[PDB]
Paper text:
Fragment screening was carried out via both 19F NMR spectroscopy and X-ray crystallography using a library of 388 fluorinated compounds with great structural diversity. This library was originally assembled for 19F NMR detected screening, with the compounds grouped into 20 pools, each of which consists of up to 20 compounds. However, the robust crystallisation system we established for hFBL allowed us to apply exactly the same set of pools for crystallographic screening, and bound fragments were unambiguously identified from the electron density map. Compound 1 binds to the adenosine region of the hFBL cofactor binding site by an induced fit mechanism, which involves a significant rearrangement in the loop connecting the β4 strand and α5 helix. The compound induces a significant shift of the protein backbone around D236-Q242 resulting in extensive movement of the side chains of V237 (5.9 Å) and Q242 (5.2 Å). The movement of the side chain of V237, which forms a hydrophobic interaction with the adenine moiety of SAM in hFBLSAM, results in displacement of the side chain of Q242 from a buried to a solvent exposed position, and exposure of a new hydrophobic pocket (L166, A235, V237, I245, and V246) that accommodates the trifluoromethyl group of the compound. Compound 1 also forms hydrogen bonds with the side chain carboxylate of E191, the backbone nitrogen of F192, and a water molecule that interacts with the backbone nitrogen of A217 and the backbone carbonyl of E216. One of these fragment complexes (compound 1) revealed structural plasticity at the cofactor site as binding of the fragment lead to exposure of a hydrophobic cavity that accommodated the tri-fluoro moiety of the compound. Our discovery of conformational dynamics and a hydrophobic cavity at the hFBL cofactor site will help to facilitate structure-guided design of hFBL inhibitors.
Fibrillarin (FBL) is an essential and evolutionarily highly conserved S-adenosyl methionine (SAM) dependent methyltransferase. It is the catalytic component of a multiprotein complex that facilitates 2′-O-methylation of ribosomal RNAs (rRNAs), a modification essential for accurate and efficient protein synthesis in eukaryotic cells. Fibrillarin consists of an N-terminal glycine–arginine-rich domain (GAR), which is believed to be important for organisation of the nucleolus, and a C-terminal domain with a Rossmann fold that is characteristic of class I S-adenosylmethionine (SAM)-dependent methyltransferases. In the present study, we determined, to our knowledge, the first crystal structures of hFBL in ligand-free state, bound to the native cofactor SAM, and in complex with two fragments that can compete with SAM for binding to the cofactor site.
Residue numbers in the entry: 85 to 99, 105 to 317
Write the structure that this text describes.
């Protein structure tokens, strides 16, 4: 009788959505934990709340790829207090790496406390608008995740990609249309942001919206193909 089944996405499981807890015994944001013991074996999972984590909403919504997998190197822009980052850290595991870039010092203190227990998280308390200021800290990554909410932030993500994202690496970008242009339709916003990505050789491969968890919020996944 298996209680927690592997999801299609490696490192993700269904119990609903959970990740394998890199730090057994501890919750990050009050989430439920499920510890299963059999003989001498023991594994713990943490519930992943799609109402707080856009990535979890996208997974439940059926996104085909997330590119966040065991051993992956991740640049996470807008890491906030580390809710979603903690689950990314679970997925990439001890051989992966998560750079958690966050502008707010208050949020940064939460990230630093989270990363004390998680070897694979590097807090980077900096303004993502100016990646030249922290470029010396960031090894080239496999995937960039970003939460975009202003009409200049796809371009910020792209500037980070041009500095840090490997050729043929991937991006997962959440778009809050209301925050980009509240006078535009959500479709106008999502089309315009996809266009901005394409201009930067960030080529979308799929996109979805996040109902019932969020209103007028899309996640775009794609591939980075810079010219020579
Ligand atoms: C909550 C949050 C979101 N965010 C988004 C960006 C980028 F412009 F890179 F997209 C940067 C940040 C950040 O420092 N904090």
């Amino acid at each position: 009788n298996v209680m927690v089944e592997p999801h299609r996405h490696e490192g993700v499981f269904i119990c609903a959505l959970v990740t394998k807890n890199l730090v057994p015994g501890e919750s990050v944001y009050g989430e439920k934990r499920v510890s299963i013991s059999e003989g001498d074996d023991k594994i713990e999972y943490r519930a992943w709340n799609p109402f707080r984590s856009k990535l979890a909403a996208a997974i439940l919504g059926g996104v085909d790829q997330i590119h966040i997998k065991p051993g992956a190197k991740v640049l996470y822009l807008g890491a906030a207090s580390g809710t979603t980052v903690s689950h990314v850290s679970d997925i990439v595991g001890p051989d992966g790496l998560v750079y958690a870039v966050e502008f707010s010092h208050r949020s940064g203190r939460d990230l630093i406390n989270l990363a004390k227990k998680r070897t694979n998280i590097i807090p980077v308390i900096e303004d993502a608008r100016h990646p030249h200021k922290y470029r010396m800290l960031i090894a080239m990554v496999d995937v960039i995740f970003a939460d975009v909410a202003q009409p200049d932030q796809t371009r910020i993500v792209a500037l980070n990609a041009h500095t840090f994202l490997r050729n043929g690496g991937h991006f997962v970008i959440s778009i809050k249309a209301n925050c980009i242009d509240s006078t535009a339709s959500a479709e106008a916003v999502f089309a315009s942001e996809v266009k901005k990505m394409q201009q930067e050789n960030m080529k979308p491969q799929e996109q979805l919206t996040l109902e019932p968890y969020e209103r007028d919020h899309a996640v775009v996944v794609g591939v980075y193909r810079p010219p020579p």
